[PDB]
Amino acid sequence: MIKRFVITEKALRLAERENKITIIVERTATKKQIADEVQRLYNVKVEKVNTLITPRGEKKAYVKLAEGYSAMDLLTKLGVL
């Protein structure tokens, strides 16, 4: 489901300040599916998912982790940071 992570300047500021990881998923993936995929794949807890479809045709999801998990820690653990 997940295609990649967004490590732009905006996405990195979000990870340190709002505990949000930004991902690119399939265009048909819903908020229920994105929260299930993030929890299953990484073993964390998701508070809410904000999703948008980019002007280039992709779906971007701002996944806010619950307040026991570090958004930057998961980025640095995956090695995508």
Partner: protein, 50 residues
Amino acid sequence: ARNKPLGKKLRLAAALNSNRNPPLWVIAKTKRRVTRSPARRHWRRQKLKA
């Protein structure tokens, strides 16, 4: 438009992705034969009938 249908928006995404000249290595790879793309357009000159 401010309010879009997703089908119309996706076709604009396809046009946005393709609007770009060939990369500089392609020009060197083809010995300056491939220099222009037919999917290149300007928003003010050529209008999509999306």
